[PDB]
């Protein structure tokens, strides 16, 4: 039940994806999913489809039952900001706002995607919030340079320039959040909406 730090680690995605095909990460994934009732600790999301287990200490070789926690797609793509958008599915966009923690932004983004995708009369309000989120994304690019508003290019420019210390990384990612993009996350949110509305109304 920790908090989300936008950690740009260079040799983490290789070990994570190498774990994800093996049987130890899969059996431990089923054990954690049965233990945590498929609940995202980071934002509280609750679904059976497209959720994954991350670490807490950054060690993706050693993986016990205590440090391995479960999280939703947005909070799990937050832990690897160096390769998102280029990693097949899953997308992101860096925004500048101090009013929200990353977990509260992920929960509000889940609410806005539920009010846009499966419409109950609140499509206009959620789209009007998402507009200003994208405008804050446009505000970032004036400070950090043109072209690096996307998180993959920013992770590349970070861990290609030689910064590993938590002090300089926490002062560089200060007042920066990672808003997950809707149009790249359309398959997952429409799968969750269709599965829920076929589970309730059958």
């Amino acid at each position: 039940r920790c908090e989300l730090k936008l950690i740009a680690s260079p040799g983490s995605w290789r070990l994570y994806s190498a774990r994800k095909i093996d049987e130890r990460f899969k059996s431990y994934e089923q054990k954690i999913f049965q233990r945590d009732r498929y609940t995202c600790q980071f934002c509280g999301f609750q679904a059976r489809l497209y959720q994954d287990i991350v670490n807490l200490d950054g060690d993706y070789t050693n993986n016990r039952l205590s440090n391995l926690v479960t999280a939703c797609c947005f909070c799990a793509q937050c832990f690897f900001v160096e390769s998102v958008g280029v990693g097949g599915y899953g997308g992101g966009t860096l925004i500048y706002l101090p009013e929200l923690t990353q977990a509260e932004l992920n929960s509000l983004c889940h609410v806005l995607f539920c009010a846009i995708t499966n419409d109950t009369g609140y499509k206009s309000s959620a789209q009007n919030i998402y507009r200003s989120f994208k405008f804050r994304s446009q505000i970032v690019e004036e400070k950090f340079g043109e072209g690096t508003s996307d998180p993959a290019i920013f992770g590349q420019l970070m861990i290609d320039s030689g910064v590993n210390s938590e002090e300089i990384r926490e002062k560089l990612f200060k007042n920066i959040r990672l808003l997950p993009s809707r149009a790249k996350f359309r398959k997952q949110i429409e799968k969750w909406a269709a599965s829920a509305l076929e589970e309730i109304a059958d």
Binding site: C43, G44, F45, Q46, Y96, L97, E99, L100, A103, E104, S107, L108, H110, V111, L112, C114, A115, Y122, S125, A126, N128, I129, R131, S132, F133, F135, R136, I139, V140, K143, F144, G145, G147, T148, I153, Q156, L157, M158, D160, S161, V163, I168, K171, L172, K174, N175, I176
Partner: protein, 473 residues
């Protein structure tokens, strides 16, 4: 001794040879019923027992030689060091996809160190000198356009540029046309590469500075007379074989093969039946090897301890001027050659002004008068049975495919270097964290809606904040 050739018939002893005698190129002479091909394959085994990749240019019309050479290579474990370009396939029946891969690709014009001028002059061979100056200017322009422009070099693009009105658009209209929707300018190109084509267009008899319409009727006869051999050879090479040449990243290039000891078997269809194009097909291979050996090899390398042999089976029909010579740049390669022909007066039939020079510059001669042969040394003639290796055949003859990777394009690496050079000053200066407070009329309202609520679970608090925002606006 280092290399093994054969065993004496009279008293029964073997006869090795040394590396200094091997670097002087050999020569073997035998008819079609003497078993020359298995003797060359056994000498290829003798070169493969010590880690040296023989180049086998065969033009006797043998499709059952790749099985023998592949069994010999797989017998030595270095199956990865094998490339096969098969020039005996059909004509232009390869379009789009293909059911199975038949042969590797070879394009000697993509990785060019500006030795393709010499490559094309020995693929060709004052109309002759006029055509040679013309193709030298054209090869300079095309290598300068291959270095940084969006034009890929092969037989097809040079064959497209063998015409006049595109070249008139090159020199006079000073723009760059291609077989593609493109408009590349020559106003940024320097003068030193555009001048020799203008000097070629000066020295023709009938020229008009303004338009092309009169001068084409004046000089198309001279243009055809100077470019007919080049356009027929490049039309054959670019239309009959489109799955061997029209690639970009060539799987086999002859600097890699002789510099890293890889095996290349190239099979020619025939050379006694219709030699107008197939001799040119063999001459392209020997021309690329000679040009990327003599003038393109480039603080001081040592001499190789392994003898390398390009076993050329029919050097009578394809020929280049001075292949038996080896410059000082290529003596470190441990290079050699084993030429062969049908019969020596037939060899005197086969090439013009060459059969003496290959007779003079090649030290070792072998006579296979119809028990395989007897050796023609400088000192002593000896009757000796040659080496006989019979490779047991393979169940499946899988030719190893490759990929076609590229460096990342310069429209992206320049952008990445510019972004990194902009980010380095931000990360260095220390004033790197954002502090400017920009506010909308929306984020403050949704933040107040998230702040005023007190429900513990964040999803319910988010939907309550959305409810409060829709109720307030």
């Amino acid at each position: 001794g280092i290399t093994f050739f054969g065993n004496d018939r009279k008293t029964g002893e073997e006869l090795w040879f040394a590396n200094d005698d091997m670097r002087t190129h050999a020569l073997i002479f035998g008819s079609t019923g003497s078993g020359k091909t298995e003797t060359l394959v056994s000498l290829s085994y003798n070169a493969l027992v010590q880690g040296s990749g023989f180049i086998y240019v065969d033009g006797k019309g043998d499709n059952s030689l790749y099985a023998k050479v592949f069994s010999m290579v797989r017998s030595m474990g270095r199956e990865d060091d094998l490339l096969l370009i098969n020039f005996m396939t059909g004509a232009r029946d390869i379009v789009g996809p293909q059911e199975k891969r038949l042969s590797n690709t070879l394009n000697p014009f993509c990785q060019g160190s500006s030795s393709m001028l010499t490559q094309l002059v020995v693929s060709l061979m004052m109309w002759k000198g006029r055509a040679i100056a013309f193709v030298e200017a054209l090869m300079r322009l095309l290598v300068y356009m291959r270095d940084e422009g969006a034009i890929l070099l092969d037989a097809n693009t040079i064959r497209n540029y063998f015409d006049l009105q595109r070249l008139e658009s090159i020199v006079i209209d000073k723009v760059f046309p291609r077989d593609d929707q493109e408009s590349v300018n020559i106003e940024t190109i320097p003068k030193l590469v555009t001048d020799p084509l203008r000097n070629y267009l000066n020295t023709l008899p009938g020229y008009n500075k303004e338009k092309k319409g009169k001068q084409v009727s004046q000089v198309l006869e001279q243009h055809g007379f100077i470019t007919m051999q080049l356009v027929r050879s490049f039309s054959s090479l670019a239309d009959t074989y489109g799955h061997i040449i029209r690639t970009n990243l060539a799987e086999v290039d002859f600097k890699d093969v002789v510099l890293n000891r890889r095996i290349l078997v190239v099979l020619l269809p025939a050379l006694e039946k219709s030699p107008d194009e197939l001799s040119n097909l063999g001459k392209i291979i020997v021309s690329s090897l000679k040009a990327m050996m003599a003038a393109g090899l480039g603080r001081k390398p040592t001499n190789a301890p392994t003898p390398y042999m390009c076993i050329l089976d029919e050097y009578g029909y394809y020929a280049v001027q001075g292949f038996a010579v080896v410059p000082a740049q290529a003596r470190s390669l441990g290079f050699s050659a084993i030429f062969a022909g049908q019969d020596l007066p037939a060899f005197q039939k086969a090439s013009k002004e060459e059969a003496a020079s290959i007779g003079a510059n090649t030290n070792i001669k072998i006579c296979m008068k119809l028990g395989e042969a007897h050796i023609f040394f400088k000192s002593k003639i000896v009757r000796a049975r040659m080496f006989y290796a019979n490779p047991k055949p393979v169940k499946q003859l899988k030719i190893n495919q490759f990929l076609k990777v590229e460096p990342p394009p310069d429209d992206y690496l320049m952008k990445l270097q510019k972004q990194l050079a902009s980010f380095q000053s931000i990360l260095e200066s220390g004033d790197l964290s954002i502090n400017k407070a920009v506010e909308n009329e929306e984020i403050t309202l949704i933040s107040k809606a998230l702040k005023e609520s007190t429900i513990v679970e964040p999803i319910e608090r988010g939907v309550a904040a959305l409810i409060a925002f829709h109720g307030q606006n």
